[PDB]
Design a protein around this nucleic acid. Structure first.
Lengths: 104, 196, 51, 173, 162, 130, 118
RNA sequence: UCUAGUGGGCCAUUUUUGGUAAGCAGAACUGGCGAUGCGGGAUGAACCGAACGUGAGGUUAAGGUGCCGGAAUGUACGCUCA
RNA sequence: UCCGCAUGAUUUAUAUGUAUAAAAAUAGAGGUAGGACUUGUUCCUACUCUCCUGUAUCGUAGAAGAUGGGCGAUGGUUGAUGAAACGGAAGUGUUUUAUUGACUUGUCCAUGAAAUUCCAUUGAAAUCUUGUGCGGAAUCGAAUCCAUUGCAUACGACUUUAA
């Protein structure tokens, strides 16, 4: 048992100066610092893992899943679409980018 | 691209605004930042210009009640804290959390002198300012605007420097013995085949 | 009829439904089998360079 | 990027003169449309000809005959200032006259706030003799034993290490 | 009202060129995640893989081609393995949906050492016996298969060659 | 110690010729220089000093020499081997090999590093008793 | 009845009905000369519009794909004998307990679903 | 054919007259606000872009890419110490 | 209220290796015992180790990591204690020795990981509290109101006294 995912941070939603779009989240992936390098992570599964107070099915760990869609900017930031939109309180929180849709 | 738990930054040789921008972005990204030796920060422009800038800031206080007016902190760490707060949306819960994730101190106190200290190249004065361009030190600026701990910080820093020199020499001797033993290993050729 | 519009530039079946000649169309026809002369001209080169 | 074109034009033949004269100009324009526009702009100032009453009989892009040889280019220009008009001379060391013209435009914009519209390129020539060179700064680059230190630069950047936020050690020089 | 007939014909799946039989691959999900296994054959779009059950404990099982990272490790001779036996029917659960109930407390009888039928461990031993000599021939290959892949600090999957 | 001059051997850092070795044959200005290489895939070109890093090798090359003469001087001298037999080239080659290593090679490196660590620790302890 | 999608589930509350108790929740179109809701300034409440209309096929359908036909007696249930797969029976609130039991038993015999059953 | 409301206007570009001038008064053309939401100019009835049914995906205009703030502490050549 | 108990819950857990403590300048002596000689603004010793900045170094194989061996030094990691020493800028940490456990993958074997037979999860030990049988004795307090004084005072508050 060890780590099989890439580190990521939830920066913000897709937004203009004054209008936000919570349907898409901006994700900064560790080690990805180019829009060309973001192509590898395009389509990869990305999950937000958090702990609650009430156990469900004998577990307090709840995961919200999503997929990386397209790169954002020139610095390797990517756009992610989740099944449920990430809460804005999770800005700056950690995310796990898996390798499940692998192509290598 | 740094996802560390806590990052400790040596503020010496760093430009105030550029370091504040980098720290503020890291705080919003969710990284705890500790800044040490804030009295060694650098601001572009000559000392008289920076002194006038601080005096102009100091003149701004509430007319009917200075007690509730603007609070002008003189310490170099608080000057850096004010800069970071300006670059942060401090009037929101998210901005308040980011600001509270920042710890700026003068010198390197006992909590942090035994930890790795990194630098931000984007804010380093030597590679961001033309040689010959005048610059000031926030420690000198603070001491001339009412900071009363310039000498004690210098004395404590000197004591930390001699302690760190002794620690470095001891680690230097240990790394020597490890390196000398490493040069006599029987797997150097096979490691060099893979490039190690 | 025609519930959805197919792009002939992408759907080859529609590109066959329209333009039946597309099957026999031949591109990249080579015509440089000759000596390939250099029709530059002394006057043209002098004017081209000039000052 | 700019390109150099030769543009040959003439007035549309009329009953008075069935054989009008042909006029050629070497112009630096981003594309052929701008080159033809510049040709008519300069021709209207000299001859009683317009785009409507004239035509373009030829246009050919000109490439540098020796793009791998370092050369000195002398450029004579006439530019409009905020007060009046002045004629100036410039010297640039480059491998292409297009690059010399681009350097001239950048220098004029930086040193005189002169836009493209206010600059007329009177003449561009290649300096052959060493004593022909007028600027001492340009002539000092013709010393065979030329040796100067590397100019100051913002260190060596990397696509990933340059974007790295933190560095373990302070860089040296 | 019967619906129309869709013009969606079923055509064979073409997998990647790096998923050839005998390739060492890393499992990315499931119980055996991070395990290095050997590809025996490709059924339709899944790889019938088995890391040598005596060296890592991974049995003969399918794995989705997307959930697999292909490694550039030297190929393992697999031509002697009877891959014709492994079909979709072989890796198919007994027909349950219907006349059975989702009764709990059945994990005891569903656990191994009694739920594994005959000839399954037999083919596992047979495949292992045919694969070990080539595996042991290559140095460090047996230890590589026994080890588990993991990401360390500074590892960047988009820049590393697997 | 390192200066821009005719015949100075330089290493390209930016552009499609990253990591290649060339020599300055002429100086255009203080921002650009004309460089050439004996390799058949490195054409003679003009590059800016920001895209290259100077080395410690200086050749006896005439100013504005053509490609054939530059190659002849390069081959007559030991410039290729002089650069190769240096810490810079060896470190760069080691980085190239490390970047080219695959998962199996990395596992082999890990095993060899384990053996080296065990031998080093034993050697250090044995030397401590002398 | 299949793949029912709601364009909007909010009830289009009236402007300032939260501020004042005398202002009812029922929607009224603002007709003020300086009204910001009518001008549709950013950040204000939305107004009901014809564009919010749901699909004609799935309109008036319950999440189960049926339509709640009100029944007050047994004969109203018999009206749904042929339309078993499209109409469900909603027993009227003023129907007594005896007649409600009779309606439920008749709907069960006819195979008609009942929304307010039990 | 019948009838409603209107019969206080205002702003901007350009051409002007009266005025020392005016966020002044009066004329002409066009576009607007009035009755126009939306993106930008930190803000704004008129300025720039663009005229709006309810949504998904993509790309733009004007405008921006150090942080607040989404986006290069990008590239090339120069000038500037206040 | 301390020790023993042996349990549950909490989270360090914004965790997934969340390992890395010289100083100083930036046309420098970068410093890497840096080499080098006598502590000296001498070194001509080293002259390319600086300039892939860390893409580095340390560590990383074992049913979330089991059960038994042959050899290789005679070491290494992690706990329970010991004499302790050094740490005060926020020292709450860093080191030596001795008693004494567990592991060691440095190399080579043997058995066991399945059916959770294609993904939709968290693996356990420990550290701080309380929800309870209590053996062991319990060494143990104060503040305020009601009173009092005026160095105080609109009322509160403040300075005294008190059993």
């Amino acid at each position: 048992g060890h780590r099989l995912y890439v580190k990521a941070k939830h920066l913000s939603f897709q937004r203009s100066k004054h209008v936000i779009h919570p349907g898409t989240s901006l994700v900064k992936i560790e080690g990805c610092d180019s829009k060309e390098e973001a192509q590898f992570y395009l389509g990869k599964r990305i999950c937000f893992v958090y702990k609650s107070n009430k156990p469900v099915r004998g577990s307090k760990i709840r995961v919200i899943w999503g997929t990386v869609s397209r790169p954002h900017g020139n610095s390797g930031v990517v756009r992610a679409r989740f099944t449920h939109n990430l809460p804005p309180k999770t800005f700056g929180a950690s995310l796990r980018v898996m390798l499940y849709p692998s192509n290598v | 691209s740094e996802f560390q738990k806590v990052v400790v930054i040596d503020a010496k040789g760093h430009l105030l605004g550029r370091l504040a921008s980098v720290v503020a972005k890291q705080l919003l990204g969710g990284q705890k930042v500790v800044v040490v030796r804030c009295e060694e920060l650098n601001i572009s422009g000559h000392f008289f210009r920076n002194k006038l800038k601080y005096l102009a800031y100091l003149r701004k206080a509430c007319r009917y009640n200075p007690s509730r007016g603007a609070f002008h902190f003189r310490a170099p760490s608080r000057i850096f804290q004010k800069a970071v707060r300006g670059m942060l949306p401090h009037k929101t819960a998210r901005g308040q959390a980011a600001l509270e994730h920042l710890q700026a101190v003068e010198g390197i106190p006992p909590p942090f002198d035994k930890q790795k200290r990194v630098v931000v190249p984007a804010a380093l004065r030597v590679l961001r300012l033309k040689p010959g361009r005048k610059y000031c030190t926030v420690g000198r600026l603070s001491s001339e605007v009412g900071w009363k701990y310039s000498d004690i910080v210098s004395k404590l820093e000197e004591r930390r420097k001699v302690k760190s020199a002794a620690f470095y020499q001891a680690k230097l001797a240990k790394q020597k013995k490890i390196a000398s033993a490493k040069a006599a290993s029987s797997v150097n050729g096979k490691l060099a085949e893979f490039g190690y | 009829a025609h519930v959805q519009k197919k792009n002939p530039l992408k759907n080859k079946a529609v590109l066959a439904r329209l333009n039946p000649y597309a099957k026999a169309y031949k591109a990249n026809v080579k015509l440089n089998t000759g000596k390939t002369p250099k029709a530059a001209g002394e006057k043209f080169l002098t004017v081209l360079h000039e000052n | 990027a700019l390109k150099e074109y030769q543009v040959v034009g003439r007035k549309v033949p009329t009953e008075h003169e069935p054989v009008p004269k042909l006029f050629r100009m070497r112009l630096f324009a981003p594309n052929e449309s701008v080159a033809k526009s510049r040709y008519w702009y300069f021709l209207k100032m000299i001859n009683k000809v317009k785009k409507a009453t004239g035509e373009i009989v030829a246009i050919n892009e000109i490439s540098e005959p020796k793009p791998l040889k370092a050369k000195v280019f002398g450029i004579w220009i006439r530019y409009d200032s905020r007060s009046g008009t002045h004629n100036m001379y410039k010297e640039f060391r480059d491998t292409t006259r297009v690059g010399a013209v681009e350097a001239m435009y950048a220098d004029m914009a930086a040193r005189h706030r002169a836009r493209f519209r206010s600059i007329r390129i009177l003449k561009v020539v290649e300096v052959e003799k060493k004593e022909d060179v007028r600027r001492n700064y340009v002539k000092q680059l013709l010393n065979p034993h030329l040796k100067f230190p590397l100019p100051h630069r913002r260190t060596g950047v990397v696509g990933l290490a340059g974007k790295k936020v933190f560095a373990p050690h302070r860089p040296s020089t | 009202n019967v619906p129309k007939k869709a013009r969606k014909a079923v055509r064979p799946t073409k997998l990647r060129a790096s998923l050839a039989p005998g390739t060492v691959c890393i499992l990315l999900a499931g119980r055996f995640r991070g395990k290095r296994v050997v590809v025996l054959s490709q059924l339709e779009d899944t790889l019938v893989v088995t890391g040598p059950y005596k060296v890592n404990g991974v049995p003969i099982r399918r794995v989705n081609h997307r959930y697999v990272i292909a490694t550039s490790a030297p190929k393992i001779d697999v031509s002697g393995v009877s891959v014709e036996k492994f079909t979709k029917a072989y890796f198919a659960k007994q027909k349950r949906s219907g006349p059975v109930k989702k009764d709990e407390a059945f994990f005891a009888e569903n656990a191994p050492k009694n739920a594994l039928p005959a000839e399954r461990i037999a083919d596992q031993k047979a495949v292992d016996a045919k694969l070990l000599p080539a595996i042991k021939a290559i140095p460090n290959m047996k230890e590589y298969l026994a080890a588990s892949f993991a990401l360390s600090n500074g590892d960047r999957p988009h820049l590393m060659k697997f | 110690k390192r200066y821009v001059e005719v015949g100075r051997v330089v290493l390209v850092t930016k552009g499609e010729y990253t990591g290649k070795l060339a020599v300055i044959v002429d100086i255009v200005d203080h921002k650009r220089a004309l460089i050439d290489s004996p390799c058949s895939e490195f054409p003679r070109q003009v590059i800016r000093y920001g895209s290259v890093v100077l080395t410690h090798i200086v050749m006896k090359l005439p100013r504005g020499a053509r490609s054939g003469i530059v190659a002849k001087k390069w081959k007559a001298q030991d410039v290729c081997n002089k650069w190769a037999s240096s810490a810079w080239a060896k470190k760069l080659e080691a980085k190239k090999v490390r970047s080219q290593l695959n998962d199996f090679d990395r596992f082999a490196v890990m095993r060899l590093k384990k053996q080296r660590r065990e031998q080093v620790n034993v050697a250090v302890a044995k030397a401590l008793k002398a | 009845a299949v793949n029912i999608i709601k364009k909007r589930t909010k009830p289009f509350k009236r402007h300032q009905s939260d501020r004042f108790k005398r202002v009812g929740e029922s929607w009224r179109k603002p007709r003020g000369i300086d009204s910001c809701v009518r001008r549709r300034f950013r950040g204000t409440i939305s107004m009901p519009k014809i564009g919010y209309g749901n699909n004609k096929k799935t309109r008036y359908c319950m999440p189960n794909g049926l339509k709640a036909f009100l029944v007050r007696n047994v004969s109203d249930v018999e009206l749904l004998l042929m339309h078993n797969k499209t109409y469900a029976a909603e027993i009227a609130g003023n129907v007594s307990a005896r007649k409600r039991v009779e309606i439920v038993e008749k709907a069960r015999a006819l195979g008609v679903k009942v929304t307010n059953a039990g």
